[PDB]
Subunit: 350 residues, 4 copies
Amino acid sequence: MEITNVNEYEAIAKQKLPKMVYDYYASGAEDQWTLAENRNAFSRILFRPRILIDVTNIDMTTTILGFKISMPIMIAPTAMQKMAHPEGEYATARAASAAGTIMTLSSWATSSVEEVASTGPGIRFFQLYVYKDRNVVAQLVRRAERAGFKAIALTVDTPRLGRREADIKNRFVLPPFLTLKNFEGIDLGLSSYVAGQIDRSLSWKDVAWLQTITSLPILVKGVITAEDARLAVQHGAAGIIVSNHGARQLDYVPATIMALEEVVKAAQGRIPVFLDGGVRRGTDVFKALALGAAGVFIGRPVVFSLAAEGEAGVKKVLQMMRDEFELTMALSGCRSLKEISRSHIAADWD
Amino acid sequence: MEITNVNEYEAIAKQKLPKMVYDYYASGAEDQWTLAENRNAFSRILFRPRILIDVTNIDMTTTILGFKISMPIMIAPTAMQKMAHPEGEYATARAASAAGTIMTLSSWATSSVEEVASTGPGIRFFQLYVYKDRNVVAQLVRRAERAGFKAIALTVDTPRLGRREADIKNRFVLPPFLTLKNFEGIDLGLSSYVAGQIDRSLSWKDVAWLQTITSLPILVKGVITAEDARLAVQHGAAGIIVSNHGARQLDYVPATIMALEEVVKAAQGRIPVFLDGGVRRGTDVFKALALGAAGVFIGRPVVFSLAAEGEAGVKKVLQMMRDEFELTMALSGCRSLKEISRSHIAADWD
Amino acid sequence: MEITNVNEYEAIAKQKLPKMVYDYYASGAEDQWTLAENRNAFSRILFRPRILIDVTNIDMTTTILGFKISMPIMIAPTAMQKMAHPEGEYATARAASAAGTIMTLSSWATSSVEEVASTGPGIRFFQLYVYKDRNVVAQLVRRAERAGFKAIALTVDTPRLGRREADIKNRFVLPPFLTLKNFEGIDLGLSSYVAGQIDRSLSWKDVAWLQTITSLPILVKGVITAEDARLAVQHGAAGIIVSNHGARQLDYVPATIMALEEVVKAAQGRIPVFLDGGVRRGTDVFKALALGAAGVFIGRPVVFSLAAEGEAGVKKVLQMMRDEFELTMALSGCRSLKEISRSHIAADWD
Amino acid sequence: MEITNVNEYEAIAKQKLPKMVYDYYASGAEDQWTLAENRNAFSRILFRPRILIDVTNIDMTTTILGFKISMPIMIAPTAMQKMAHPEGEYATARAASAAGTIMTLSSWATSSVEEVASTGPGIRFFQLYVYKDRNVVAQLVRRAERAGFKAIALTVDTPRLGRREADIKNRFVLPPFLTLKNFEGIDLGLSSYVAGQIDRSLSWKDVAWLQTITSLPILVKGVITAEDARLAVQHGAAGIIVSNHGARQLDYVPATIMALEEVVKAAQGRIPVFLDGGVRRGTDVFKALALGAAGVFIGRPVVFSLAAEGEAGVKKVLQMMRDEFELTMALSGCRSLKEISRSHIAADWD
Ligand SMILES: Cc1cc2nc3c(=O)[nH]c(=O)nc-3n(C[C@H](O)[C@H](O)[C@H](O)COP(=O)(O)O)c2cc1C
Ligand SMILES: Cc1cc2nc3c(=O)[nH]c(=O)nc-3n(C[C@H](O)[C@H](O)[C@H](O)COP(=O)(O)O)c2cc1C
Ligand SMILES: Cc1cc2nc3c(=O)[nH]c(=O)nc-3n(C[C@H](O)[C@H](O)[C@H](O)COP(=O)(O)O)c2cc1C
Ligand SMILES: Cc1cc2nc3c(=O)[nH]c(=O)nc-3n(C[C@H](O)[C@H](O)[C@H](O)COP(=O)(O)O)c2cc1C
């Protein structure tokens, strides 16, 4: 009896993590309708597989912003990984490098850019918020650039934090020996401070502002309507991440897989569109690409596997998804990502 | 571990109220299909949120019939609140005044207009039925006007009472020290009398009749078809309340959120259209306004919180809904009620 | 704590009847999908009630084939009622007479036409099958005419019996002191004989044949497609009963409420169309009439209430449905059956 | 208390087979969504039965590739039947001969073509894979032809094996005294070898290749899109089997009953189209033929009944389906397979 699927790592995390920690990571907003729907919506898309195609050699490699990677599955920024495992972000960085894929570090990481860069080479993105204290935004950016990060993933769906009721009932707090390391050694305990820096005044001009302090590509994260996707194209974003923040912000927003297509269309092929939210199977990954995503990101499975198995756990999550994705490409008759078409899928709404 | 949502107050009420009292308040008509659907239909409406909008200052204030209030969440008339808590309607009136919103007192209240007016200033509406004994209707109206009530909410969906089977099995009766106080000190034990006064002969001309005995605005409560909404416009109603009476009348009528739009359209912007039935979240409130409601009313949560926590409980219900509604406005990109549009929502039936 | 709804009688029957007897009556065909759907399909139809209509006086009286009855709820032919209660069909006949409605006696009754006619006056219909031995068909008809039956309800959906698996597992047999009384005292133990008489060769010409041996009106029972309804009009049926035989024949036929309209349309107002299958509430009854039925029939509730309460039980089933139907008419704004329109309902499929 | 339906045999198999064996046979791919849907999709198709048609004599006989059989229900190739019962494929062959229907032997059978041919006469098909070692493909074909097999059923949906997670957790292995007998006595322990022979390079030209080494008709098994059905017509297949391999390959492919029609249309009446996947009732069989199948195949019920009852079990599965199919034809008004039309069914998607 073995661990055969990703979703199984969640069950194990849950039996061993303290309730407050598990809930923190697992929880969605309020009644968690979108949490559930993020997963459920993938079951409303079916396959239209082609048979008798030579599928000896499958090429999953892709190029993301000029960076060539091993597969179109990247890691989404989550937060305080050291609550899940001692090595926390170090383990996640070593597994992402090992897999030939990209990691997106959280500005709320319990590891700083430099300590993450000290694990070894590997393409890494840094997630950020346009904080109130703009001098602070510039030091994080500089520090990110220095440590060798290749792009900035700007969260644009959080003017304010959504209500995740378990945290309130669990009276959630960051454990004793941990710190938000990117906020230490710069010119400003920290949890509260960082929570207060979230600027609820941001507008499109603030994204323009960010482009004057950095030369790195900017990916607006949290776009789910065609209206905002076009504005992101306009204000010169390097790509859009169709996300609902793992369903932790506003409830009742659509499943990202359902909003995907509308956003992909609005972008008009100008920039790469990615997705995250509920991706757990190689089949999920295929559907997203057939719909138009240039790649997908995974969040919760990483923290869950980390908690269960340390670095071996994240290594395993990544191996399982590329294996399952390669078999799905084989069985659908696709020899490259370029071969995946809209016709290989049939959506409930078609 | 704390109370984070409104719906939780129902569970607590239920564990402490006598079965007969709980059932009385909780029950719907016959198989209670609409009871359930009143809640469930809100989950068939999704959001289309706008991002990167300055949401520093949210204005939830609205004007209802020339009365400016703090938010578009008002209290619906329920009945015999003193079965739930000693202070019963006094507690509900003090919490509504404190919140800057309107209370709708039931003609079946266990507190009279004057005793409710003795708690302090505050805008209040009075619910009534065109009783058989028309002399009685006039004394209630006069007494209401005197006590300072600003409008009459006329129930028009009850020619006869719907069958709520639990009451029959529980052999429901009003507890000993309580009375229907509005029916005492006027020119006519009381429960039976009041039950017999419900006139099953009422027609549109009876609404005209009511306008000859009062100068206060009349809101027809219980309109769910476009046909009746237009007749209400005609017979000079000051606004319509799309209601199904908390699903206690006829079963299998649509969820009020589903009938809302048809009624809003028929009214052609001439008069304000409100809604009640199943509103439990700030998200619910947003959907109703995006559909066209000028405001919403809450019924059961008030009695449930009253039973659990007295006046602090109702205070809490109101604070939770305005908090949750303000965050929903922030996350959808709306700085005023005027900014809420039809485009910020996507209904299953669109 | 009291019995408030019809469906409750089933639960009580079940706790007291021997498993074999309960199963016999309760069971549907094979996986019993249509059994369930017969009930479930009524929940896919909603109301569009009119308010403020004088509903002082409700007239539920209707005329069925020149016979004026108290309400549009009649009793369907079931079978061997004496397995459920000693008085069996005598009790059902006295309750139907008392209620001012029509009873349809089964040719499989454990009581004969004359013994049913000996309970008192009352309009009664007789259900039959065109048996193999045509001489037998003529004696039943004659005997029916003699005993004062007003019409023949001809089952046309049973060339062969459907598979009701519980009967097979229960090794079902008619209890010792009972007999199929209509098959005794005529020119032909009986259960087997009667089971063998079912003619699987019947065609439309056999219905013509029946009209040469009787002058009584013929109602073809078991029509669910528009094709067969038109043929029934042609071959001079006095009315059609949209039935699926209580879902005991072929599984996966539609719920009668779903097939109703197609049949009502095909009949083009030429003859009365009735319905049976899953009718348990006054609300059910309203929907059927709004769709076009001239009346409905109830089967299982009668045997269940009989088993629970004898004649008082059937009396109660009938009182509960007319009460619930009158309140539904009041709440929908209908003062006569003629006032019930298609516009007072909204079907999922509209 | 008796066994009345096929599905019941699964429950009994499960209580007596070792977990590893049961799981092997029962399992679907990954989350087994299509497994479930293979069954569930039959419930979305309803009947439109004709009444009063002489249904004395029902003719279920059909002709499949010039071979006249007793009914349109054949047996699908499964694998290693001797894990389920000692007699394994011998028992299945004797029951198929006895029933007057066709058996499809698996190339993974625990019995060889000749030993299956030694049970007696009977029409038999042989399932195969275009193995890597093409010399091996030719010996199996020759051996099949010799033993008297009439057609080849070529699996075309398995370039690679789908992930059936229970097998991995159960560490599945073929029991000690069994062997893949068709792979012994030819020019090449065996399980591993045979697993490695599956050629993931196959294309349409490989099907052309097969036609140069055999004169027997070729039925491409595993076609579910209209695109591939037309290519199969082109490359001269003798018929197509709409299959999803019992849902064990790729998950999220449609239920075969849902893909059926699209494939039947694409074939343009040129060649016979068959179906398998989830067929458990005589009603299932009718729906497939009304949709256009020339016949259906059953897989799992055979192994389950084998495990429960040996040869008597398979005999019983076949008798139950023809009985149930004949009654469904009687009740729908069909006297021959030719009489089954598209109009006798109404699909959810129509
Ligand atoms: C604990 C946690 C913290 C997160 N913090 C952020 C954040 O600060 N900014 C952001 O844009 N997304 C944040 N996310 C969302 C992820 O970046 C990603 O959108 C989501 O987790 C993907 O969905 P999934 O877990 O179903 O894979 C967070 C997610 C988790 C679980
Ligand atoms: C115990 C109780 C008594 C009520 N009495 C009346 C009434 O006399 N007249 C009326 O129009 N509505 C009455 N209502 C309905 C409310 O005014 C309102 O329509 C409904 O409660 C709102 O639905 P909700 O509880 O899901 O918030 C009553 C509701 C309850 C729970
Ligand atoms: C035990 C039993 C026997 C029945 N026998 C017949 C029959 O011989 N002929 C017939 O047309 N219908 C027969 N029916 C069906 C009823 O006449 C009627 O169609 C069905 O019971 C109505 O559905 P309901 O029980 O949900 O009210 C029988 C029903 C039951 C329960
Ligand atoms: C244990 C097992 C092994 C099978 N092996 C094969 C195979 O080697 N090739 C193939 O085309 N189908 C194979 N099938 C699928 C069957 O031929 C058929 O498509 C499927 O079992 C029919 O679905 P059902 O079991 O719901 O009747 C296998 C099925 C089972 C259960």
